[PDB]
Structures are given as C-alpha cells and as structure tokens.
Amino acid sequence: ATKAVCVLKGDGPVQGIINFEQKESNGPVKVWGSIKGLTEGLHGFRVQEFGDNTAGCTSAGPHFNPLSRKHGGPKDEERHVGDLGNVTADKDGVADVSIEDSVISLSGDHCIIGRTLVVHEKADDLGKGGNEESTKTGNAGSRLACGVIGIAQ
Amino acid sequence: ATKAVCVLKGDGPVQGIINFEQKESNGPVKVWGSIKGLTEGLHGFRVQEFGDNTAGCTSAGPHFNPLSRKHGGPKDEERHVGDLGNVTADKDGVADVSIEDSVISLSGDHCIIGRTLVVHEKADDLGKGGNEESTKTGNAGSRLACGVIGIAQ
Ligand SMILES: [Zn+2]
Ligand SMILES: [Zn+2]
Ligand SMILES: [Zn+2]
Ligand SMILES: [Zn+2]
C-alpha cells in the first residue's frame, strides 16, 4: 500500500493538490483532490515522463509512455500510461478530481512517483482530433500548472 | 533510473537546481548544482522522507531513515540515509554543490526519487552537538528551500 501527493503550481492562477492511493501493487490507483483558478470547462490532465520542472512545465517532456503507444483517453486501449483524460472546472473555476485508473501505478514500471502531473489550458481531445498532434498530446493547449509526484505518509 | 533533478524553492530568496546521477544501481550517486540566496557559510542539506509539499517545506516529515539510525554526517556509518551534511555558500551567497554519496540511491530501498531535498538556515552539526536534538536533526535550524526529487532519466 502506497500513497503519493502532488502540488500543482504555475505562473498564473492555476493551483491544486492531487492525492494518489494504491491499496495493492497491481491494483487501481485512486486519484483525488482539487484544482482551482481554472476557466470553466474541460482541461487536459496527464502525467509527463520526467519530474523535471527546471524550465517550468516544458522540462517534464512527453506524456509518460513506457509502451511507446499513441495518445488516447484513459479508457482507450491505445493510450500513454500517463493519459488521465480531462478534469472539469465549474463556474467558480474549481475542478474537483475523483478518478480511478488501473494503468498508472505507485510502484513497478508504470510508477508515476517522481514524474510530473500537469493540467492544461484546453480539453484533451483524447486522440480523436484527426491530426498528428492529437495522436501525440491530445491538443490540450499550453500547460497551466504542474508539480512532481511525491511519496506521501 | 540513472538521473534525477530537484528544484529548491522557499518563501525567501533561496533557490537552486540540484542534479543527481547514478549509472550503476548499487553505485555512487553524483550530486551537483548550485543554490543561491544563502548567507555565507555552512547550510544543512538533507533528504526528508516524504515528497509532500502541501504545507511548504514543513510537511516533508523527518530525515529519510529506512535503516532506523541516528543523525550523522555523510561520512558516518551511523547516519540517516538522507543525511547529506552541509553545503557551503560563498560571499555572494552561492553554494556550488559537489557530492558523491553511496548511501542515497536513485532506485531500491534507499531511493530518494519522490522525496524532499531541503537546505537549512544554519549548519548541520553532524550529530556532534552534544544535546539530544543533535542526534535527531543536527540543529540546522529552519528550512529555507525544498523541492521534490524527480526522475530526469
Ligand atoms: Zn498522452
Ligand atoms: Zn481495439
Ligand atoms: Zn538526519
Ligand atoms: Zn568504521
């Protein structure tokens, strides 16, 4: 049993705290928390490969993708390990996050600890946008906030 | 993994980027980079157990200590895995960091990925202060800057 936590911060208003919990080494991972300072609507939400924020969110690189797959939604059979779809911000700019995912992990080779959680300007088109960027990143526009995923007590 | 990076930030002017390399899984870890905005002199430098920065540098818990040892210097056999001694800041408040350590690791039981690197207000006394706190924390005062250690390769 493992827990992780991530504090998302950026250059603007977007700020949040995301908790991860995994009860068993191969089990589903529970992702929950809150992000605020968002424009109402859907925002791309994923894990980038590196826990590298030296030049801001760019340094974190491509979506975490150890199986060398194409970008997709979290319930698609072709996706990056890091692909967690969209979070939804309400009228107050608050995205209450409550995800379960069975592909990310807090141990083993899908371990996302030490990697970067990021929230984006626009919606993830889930790899269904009909262009090359869709199949790479989901066309979610610029990165608004990110942080390194750490071990939690 | 093989390469790590940590961005240190605080509420004051202390900031820096710390790199880690370990090409052999049991082997030494090279630690290098620079921390600026420090008072001239020795500053405690350690890995805390949790990569939890939800309440700033406070929420990262105790020195990383999976072997249940007392606080020591990095050269000591009795030390916390996280005990990395002191960095030295010059007249301009810049601390060039150059360290080789074979107790921390970028994988396994002593993996520091997902944990907190911190730099302190004053010197770590390396467990030689004579009081009770010395063998607990090394009396390095308050936490000036921290960050979560992330995967870089
Ligand atoms: Zn993706
Ligand atoms: Zn199919
Ligand atoms: Zn210690
Ligand atoms: Zn000896």
For chain B, what are the domain ranges? 1-153
Determine the distance separating the centroid of ligand 3 and the alpha carbon of B62, expressed in angstroms.
8
Please say whether the beta carbons of A56 and A144 come within 8 A.
Answer: no
- Tokens in use for A133? 């960027």
Q: Measure CA A15 to chain center.
A: 14
Closest CA relative to residue B80, chosen from B29, B134, B42? B134
In sequence order, what DSSP letters do the residues of A7-50 get, joined into one string?
A: EEB-SSS-EEEEEEEESSTTS-EEEEEEEESPPSEEEEEEEES-
How far apart, in Å, are the Cα atoms of B28 and each of A134, B25, B79, B104? 42, 9, 16, 8
Q: Measure CA B120 to chain center.
A: 9
Residue by residue, what is the 3-state secondary structure of chain B? CCEEEEEEECCCCCEEEEEEECCCCCCCEEEEEEEECCCCEEEEEEEECCCCCEEEEHHHCCECCCCCCCCCCCCCCCCCCCEEEEEEECCCCCEEEEEEECCCECCHHHECCCCEEEEECCCCCCCCCCCCHHHCCCCCCCEEEEEECEECC
**DSSP class of A64:** P
Pairing of strands B116-120, A2-8: unpaired
Residues 6+ positions from A93 with CB-CB distance below 8 Å? A13, A36, A37, A38, A39, A40
In a 13 Å sphere around the CA of A142, the CA atoms on its Cβ side amount to 7
Calpha distance A117→B68 (Å, rounded): 32
Tell me how close the Cα of B130 comes to any Cα of chain A, in angstroms.
31
DSSP helix/strand/coil, A84: strand
Determine the distance separating the centroid of ligand 2 and the alpha carbon of A81, expressed in angstroms.
17
Q: Measure CA B133 to chain center.
A: 18
In the chain, the amino acid numbered A152 is: A
Resolution limit, Å = 2.3
How far apart, in Å, are the Cα atoms of B54 and each of A24, B1, B113, B116, B140? 24, 26, 17, 12, 22
Rounded (10°) CA dihedral B100, B121, B50, B4: -40
Task: Specify whether domain B1-153 bears CATH 2.60.40.200.
Answer: yes
Calpha distance B60→B76 (Å, rounded): 24
Calpha distance B92→B69 (Å, rounded): 36
* Cβ neighbours of B94 (radius 10 Å): 15
Determine the distance separating the centroid of ligand 3 and the alpha carbon of B65, expressed in angstroms.
7
Which residues in chain A have Cβ-Cβ distances shorter than 8 Å to B61? 153
Closest CA relative to residue A28, chosen from A131, A103, A136? A103
What experimental approach yielded this model? X-ray
Q: Is B24 exposed, middle or buried (0-12, 13-18, 19+ CB in 10 A)?
A: exposed
- Note whether B19 contacts A: Cβ–Cβ < 8 A: no
How far apart, in Å, are the Cα atoms of B105 and each of A72, A151, B108, B142, B146? 34, 15, 7, 25, 18
| φ, ψ dihedrals at B60, nearest 5° | -85, -5
Calpha distance A15→B53 (Å, rounded): 13
Q: Which residues of A91-108 are buried (b: 16+ CB within 10 A; e: fewer)?
A: eeeebebebebebbbbee
B74-133 residues touching A, CB cutoff 8 A:
113-116
- Tokens in use for A131? 């262009």
